[PDB]
């Protein structure tokens, strides 16, 4: 049961054992504990949040251990708050890690951590809630700031309970038939205007479904608005934290009919048919999908209403979910974005890397939009979704399908 | 309900996971255990699968099936994922289905995911027969011998079966060539010198050892790679495997074969591959080492020697239990139905009920040291980085009835 002896990160490192940050991931994300604190994790540190134990199996421990190249012997030294630190201390033991230590000098060196470049763009409940009360919070937002419920259709769930403060936005408002490519400019400049929404509020988007509002992100990011965020888990970590509530349809918005800046400012954000084929066979650029393996291999379309079946011959898969609706590949057991460390290393057994042009892609936009967004809180700086997706993609019988089990090497 | 027909709806491995169900490989087990099924293809199987390969079902019983499910603790309810290509997979999903088991589904993203699998560290070390005929006719292989080759069959005595027949190009070694009495212990460096040579073997030809059986090979295998021949391998299951492929053979007298009158190394190379008594009795009574006995249970226990010509009974004391075979000529406990190694899932657990670990220097024995080298061959292949076998065995450890002896039924506590 004991701990093993304590560690410095200089000794951890001489003994090549592996940092266990034990905190929630928007604080190993960069997110300071407290004003003016520490920002990140230790150099190479994984993260085994104490509060994902509990929707944690035994296989799936020892998948998560197996995968970060735990070695059953060597040190793994342990830190954040000391609750959590002994959760995972006893997960571990009966994982069968052997030599179990705290890190003893673990974020005593503000200057030597590491982050995810714009942690700031995926928010946690605590942080929105300080905001809304008026507390002084970790990049503030610099003026106006508005939150905002997406999803698909009317509000409904919504009208039972939402978090103070926030509009709602239908998902229908920024795209539509026949493709469910995004609505016109001239039709975003009103949804915008409408939602009180100039270049530089700030934006903070969440939903039930991360990706409903990442979907709503990316457009407002193409039509210009610069300060977009999303809440990491979406509504569930709110409701999960017991903060409070607000009910009822949403009030009056005050409409803001001067957007400040010609829509689109940023129109590289989205990428038609022709754009998204020319990345294809490229080491300086990738077409990621973004579709579950049974998508990628053509067992299924994915979708009720798509009658082809197969992929896009060349795309690099970016993994994605269990099914068109789910995105298991990319969330913690609490629903927040994983490491950036492993999205970055499942991307690059694909050769999708961060100095390509890159651009993701889907059924019909909303997974690649999801990870859009974690790219870009990432620090990849040139990403785009490419909005047709297999939809438009396999409208047209032309264009070149992959089918079949296959792997990296096939999409060179 | 009994006539029910709706299929189990596939599970990603997150999914199985999650639910704690198992995954059920049902490629032969070379595949399971690394070999890829294209140049540059996935290698392995996905974390904690079970191999049940589609290949052994007509080799097992009613009986044989149920005690496998029994002891790899499949539920009758927990989920279940079967893998593989769909001839097999359905082949095990029927005997699966009436053996009972009820929830069973294809894993969906097998082998979709080349970094999360599992395999030996070196399974190139257990060849299998398409590979090596692959190899012969001058096709593109996985894990390709650096130069020269050899295939051998190795078995006690003069060349009977092989000359009905044998895998084509495989030159003949009898096991009196590698080791004699008085002890049944190795020959001298000096006589292995010679065999090498006489058997066109330098230190950089890649040898492909197979017998009849199995731990024929491994003997002269260990043997060998104790001389200090680098690139040592065996043919998974031996013989019988090449044969049940049905591939070429050929008949009559060994070929001649060039001598190679220069090794290339001082011989030994890698001396420490072998024990002498005095070292193995240094292993007992060490949590950081095993003097393991790879003899049947009647053996450890002193029912029996095992053997025609060894008087005394019982065990070294302090010995761990590395498990065997039924009785000294049989190796059930680490072969498959098809007579392939065992999955080394069940033979690390196997070991480590008895305190036998990869961090520990290790050494098999048995009565005079051919079940010990086949489990060598196997540990190695492992990856096991400290074993060796101590060639003496019960034979020379009994011989002097000063050395103390173990009896009876016991459990690894009594070999602390
Ligand atoms: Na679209
Ligand atoms: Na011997």
């Excluded at 994984?46 to 998560?64: F, G, P, R, V």
Aim: glycine residues 8%; negative net charge; hydrophobic residues 35%.
């Amino acid at each position: 049961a004991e701990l093993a002896k304590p560690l410095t990160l200089d000794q951890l490192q001489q003994q090549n054992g592996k940092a266990i940050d034990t905190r929630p991931s928007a604080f190993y994300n960069g997110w300071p504990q407290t004003l003016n604190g520490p920002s990140g994790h230790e150099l190479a540190a994984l993260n085994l949040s104490a509060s994902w134990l509990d929707k944690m199996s035994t296989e799936q421990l020892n998948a998560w251990i197996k995968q970060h190249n735990l070695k059953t012997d060597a040190p793994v030294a342990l830190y954040g708050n000391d609750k959590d630190v002994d959760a995972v201390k006893t997960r571990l033991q009966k994982a069968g890690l052997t030599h179990i230590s705290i890190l003893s000098d673990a974020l005593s060196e503000p200057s030597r951590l590491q982050k995810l470049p714009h942690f700031e763009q995926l928010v946690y409940p605590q942080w929105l809630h300080d905001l809304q009360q008026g507390k002084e919070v970790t990049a503030k937002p610099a003026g106006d700031w508005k939150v905002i419920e997406a999803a698909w259709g009317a509000p409904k769930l919504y009208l039972i309970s939402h978090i103070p403060g926030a509009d709602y936005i239908d998902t229908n408002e920024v795209e539509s038939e026949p493709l469910w490519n995004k609505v016109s400019d001239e039709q975003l400049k009103a949804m915008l205007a409408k939602h009180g929404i100039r270049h530089d509020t700030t934006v903070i988007l969440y939903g039930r479904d991360v990706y409903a509002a990442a979907r709503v992100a990316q457009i407002m990011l193409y039509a210009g608005v610069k300060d977009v965020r999303l809440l990491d888990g979406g509504w569930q970590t709110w409701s999960d934290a017991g903060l409070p509530v607000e009910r009822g349809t949403p009030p009056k918005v005050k409409a803001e009919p001067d957007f400040g800046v010609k829509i689109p400012a940023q129109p590289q954000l989205m990428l038609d048919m022709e754009q998204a084929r020319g990345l294809l066979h490229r080491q300086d650029a990738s077409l990621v999908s973004i579709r579950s393996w049974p998508e990628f291999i053509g067992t299924t379309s994915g979708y009720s209403y798509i009658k082809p079946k197969g992929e896009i011959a060349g795309a690099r898969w970016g993994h994605a979910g269990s099914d068109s609706t789910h995105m298991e590949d990319f969330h913690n057991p609490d629903g927040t974005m994983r490491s950036a460390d492993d999205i970055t290393a499942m991307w690059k057994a694909w050769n999708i890397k961060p100095e390509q042009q890159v651009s993701f892609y889907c059924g019909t936009g909303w997974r690649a939009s999801e990870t859009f967004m974690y790219a870009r809180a990432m620090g990849w700086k040139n990403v785009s979704v490419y909005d047709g997706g297999w939809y438009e993609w396999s409208s047209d019988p032309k264009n070149p399908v992959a089918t079949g089990e296959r792997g990296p090497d096939s999409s060179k």
